[PDB]
């Protein structure tokens, strides 16, 4: 009873819900300010190819921890290099265990 309450009080989002706020913004923002672009004879859609969807970019005041930050983007770099899972696959853990 106290365990659940304390965990909910702190609840450090480790991996699973770091920034999970994914909602279609290619259509949400295009309704916000694109109207006078379509109204006039202006084609700036090529320039907008730079802009990243904003819902993924989270905007809240949180606390950043050096150790935590280290762990997070170490996991990100290991993922983006894609080397752990390959050697895990050629490790054949399931065949042995």
């Amino acid at each position: 009873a106290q365990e659940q309450e304390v965990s909910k009080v702190s609840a450090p989002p480790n991996q699973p819900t770091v920034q999970v706020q994914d909602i279609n913004e290619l259509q949400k923002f295009t309704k916000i300010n694109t109207l006078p672009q379509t109204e006039e004879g202006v084609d700036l859609s090529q320039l907008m190819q730079i802009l990243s969807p904003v819902e993924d970019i989270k905007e809240k005041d949180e606390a950043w921890e050096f150790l935590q930050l280290k762990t997070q983007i170490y996991e990100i770099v290991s993922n983006m290099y894609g080397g752990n899972e390959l050697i895990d696959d050629d490790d054949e853990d399931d065949e042995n265990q």
Partner: peptide, 23 residues
């Protein structure tokens, strides 16, 4: 865990990581 060694503080937060080739 798998092919990795994790160092944990007594509080619970992860501290250090080691990655090896195999299990």
């Amino acid at each position: 865990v798998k092919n990795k060694v994790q160092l944990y503080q007594l509080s619970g937060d992860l501290e250090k990581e080691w990655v090896f080739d195999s299990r």
